[PDB]
Amino acid sequence: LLSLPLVGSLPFLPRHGHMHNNFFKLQKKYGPIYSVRMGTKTTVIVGHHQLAKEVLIKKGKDFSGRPQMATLDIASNNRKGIAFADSGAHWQLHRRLAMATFALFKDGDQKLEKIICQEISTLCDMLATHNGQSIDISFPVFVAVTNVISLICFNTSYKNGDPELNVIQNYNEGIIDNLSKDSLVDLVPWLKIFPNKTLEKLKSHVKIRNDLLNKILENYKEKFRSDSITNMLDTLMQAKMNSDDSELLSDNHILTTIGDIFGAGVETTTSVVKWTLAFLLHNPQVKKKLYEEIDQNVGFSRTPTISDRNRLLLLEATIREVLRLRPVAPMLIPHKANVDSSIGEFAVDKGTEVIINLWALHHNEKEWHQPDQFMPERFLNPAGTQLISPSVSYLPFGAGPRSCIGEILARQELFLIMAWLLQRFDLEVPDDGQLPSLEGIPKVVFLIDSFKVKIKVRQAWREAQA
């Protein structure tokens, strides 16, 4: 009896479980590096820190490309910007000038710590109004970080109640929802197989994004002066002015680079904040030790600062642990081989897609003690006095040419937001008793389901107000 002709084979079902965990579970059968082919495309998935550090860092330049996808073309205005732009002159110039802009907040009256705390102060005033009520804190945080990144990009902020904030939220959500059905890695290209309206819907939200930032740019060409460079749009048009490189710095190149910075600065930081609160609702013991730590190292005399990370070490460890258990990009952003090369002595051809399964690195049982569990302690020494790097299999912000350029801002935003909130607010399960689901929702970012938290002004903070 004969065996059937096989014209197709996939190791696991499409749309069943998170794909970063489906690739991870496949390592027990096929090892830490394997490939999948779909038509002409071959994709390599890497799930061990050694091979990952080879792709990102040792041969970083060889694998610094980004694959072309119809959906990412639209959000990037055909691969301009930074994150979805391929390797080459465009990407390298704008990333540098984007990273050069962050240097401008070293110290002064426009210090990054001072810009963060200015918006956090308004945030906590708005949250204090909800004393005794259960709310979704997504939007208040969204406003806070949106103003920070808009200050870094334009030296402008939005006043309370500005409708543009709700317009931005609407398109942010619309773009994320249509950029990918689940994570960016789609095994099967469903979008070109059946009639859908995903590209059309995505174009609609991106047009609103582009139109909104185009108007801002135009208005700013009258305000720009070469003698004053204080934000990222100043930095980039300074470059355009100076090259008089020119093709690289058109208005749509400048707009798209801002769009990447605007989008990343809001959606990542807002997301990690919600994740941390969700974990603290699930672990009151860890939550209480954070209250005890901050009362003993900062008290209520003053508000937190960036220097307090030297003594708020359980807080810094808690943030580290969320970025491990629930990485913002559990499979980073897809990489591509820019030239013929090798991974683990295995051949990888030019143009091949390469994906680092950061989820596999952060949940490897040989590199981590009980990787399923939430344990900020793992990042602290046994006496709780010094922070440690317990594992070399940890790259929350990537590494190499494609590493994250907003890491510094992110770690400051995350540390200061949770410090100010823990100082001032009790953060408890709502009256219904529902705890947030920690399963997550994989999109281009690893999001959490909306949830509510009962927020109360702490008594110890009040009593210090006399």
Q: Which residues bind ligand U7P (CB under 6 A)?
A: 75, 83, 171-172, 175-176, 179, 209, 259-260, 263-264, 267-268, 328-329, 404, 444-445
Contact 18, 440 (CB under 8 A): yes
**Which listed option, ligand HEM, ligand U7P, none, makes contact with residue 265 (CB within 5 to 8 Å by class)?**
ligand HEM
**Which listed option, ligand U7P, ligand HEM, none, makes contact with residue 445 (CB within 5 to 8 Å by class)?**
ligand U7P
**Which listed option, ligand U7P, ligand HEM, none, makes contact with residue 179 (CB within 5 to 8 Å by class)?**
ligand U7P
**Does residue 344 come out as left (phi exceeding 0), alpha (psi in the -120 to 50 range) or beta?**
left
Strands 41-46 and 353-356, by their bridges, are parallel
For residue 274, what are its two tokens?
């919600």
Residue at token pair 């004393």:
131
CB of 343 to ligand HEM, least distance (A): 15
**Which listed option, ligand U7P, ligand HEM, none, makes contact with residue 332 (CB within 5 to 8 Å by class)?**
ligand HEM
Name which of 63 and 454 has its Cβ closer to ligand HEM. Answer: 63
Distances (CA, A) of 44 to 9, 23, 347, 348: 16, 11, 11, 8
Strands 133-135 and 453-457, by their bridges, are antiparallel
Name which of 206 and 273 has its Cβ closer to ligand HEM. Answer: 273
- Which amino acid, 409? L
d(CA 98, CA 83): 12
Size of the site for ligand HEM (CB under 6 A): 25
d(CA 431, CA 455): 11
- Residue 109, judged by CB atoms within 10 A of its CB (0-12, 13-18, 19+), counts as exposed
CB of 257 to ligand HEM, least distance (A): 9
Segment 387-406, which members bind ligand HEM (CB under 6 A)? 396-398, 402-406
Contact 329, 351 (CB under 8 A): no
Q: Tell which one of 265, 304, 390, 436 touches ligand HEM (CB under 6 A).
A: 265
Segment 285-344, which members bind ligand HEM (CB under 6 A)? 323, 328-329, 332-333
| Total Cβ atoms within 10 A of residue 452 | 17
- Residue 107, judged by CB atoms within 10 A of its CB (0-12, 13-18, 19+), counts as exposed
- Position of minimal CB gap to ligand HEM: 406
Contact 116, 148 (CB under 8 A): yes
**Which listed option, ligand U7P, ligand HEM, none, makes contact with residue 259 (CB within 5 to 8 Å by class)?**
ligand U7P
CB of 327 to ligand HEM, least distance (A): 6
**Which listed option, ligand U7P, ligand HEM, none, makes contact with residue 95 (CB within 5 to 8 Å by class)?**
ligand HEM
Interface map 64-103 toward ligand HEM (x if CB under 6 A): ------------------xx-----------x--------
Residue 404 in marked binding region: yes
CB of 386 to ligand HEM, least distance (A): 23
Name which of 152 and 422 has its Cβ closer to ligand HEM. Answer: 152
Residue 172 in marked binding region: yes
Segment 350-379, which members bind ligand HEM (CB under 6 A)? none
Name which of 83 and 232 has its Cβ closer to ligand U7P. Answer: 83
CB of 431 to ligand HEM, least distance (A): 31
d(CA 408, CA 413): 9
Name which of 184 and 248 has its Cβ closer to ligand U7P. Answer: 184
Q: What is the CA radius of gyration of the chain?
A: 23
User: Under 8 Å CB-to-CB from 85, ≥6 apart: which residues?
Assistant: 66, 76, 79, 91, 94
Give, for 219, the enclosing helix (H) or strand (E): helix 198-223
Q: Tell which one of 74, 272, 361, 419 touches ligand HEM (CB under 6 A).
A: 272
CB of 139 to ligand HEM, least distance (A): 18
**Which listed option, ligand U7P, ligand HEM, none, makes contact with residue 361 (CB within 5 to 8 Å by class)?**
none
* Max intra-chain CA distance, the chain: 89
Residue at token pair 């400051």:
412
Contact 123, 153 (CB under 8 A): no
CB of 406 to ligand HEM, least distance (A): 2
| Total Cβ atoms within 10 A of residue 155 | 17
CB of 20 to ligand U7P, least distance (A): 13
- Which amino acid, 382? P
DSSP string covering 422-466, please?
HHHEEEE--TT-PPPP-S-EESSSEE-----EEEEE-HHHHHTT-
Give the single-character DSSP code of 312: -
**Which listed option, ligand HEM, ligand U7P, none, makes contact with residue 337 (CB within 5 to 8 Å by class)?**
none
**Which listed option, ligand HEM, ligand U7P, none, makes contact with residue 236 (CB within 5 to 8 Å by class)?**
none
Q: Which residues bind ligand HEM (CB under 6 A)?
A: 82-83, 95, 260-261, 264-265, 268-269, 272, 323, 328-329, 332-333, 396-398, 402-406, 409-410
Binding region for heme: 404
Binding region for substrate: 172
Binding region: 172, 404
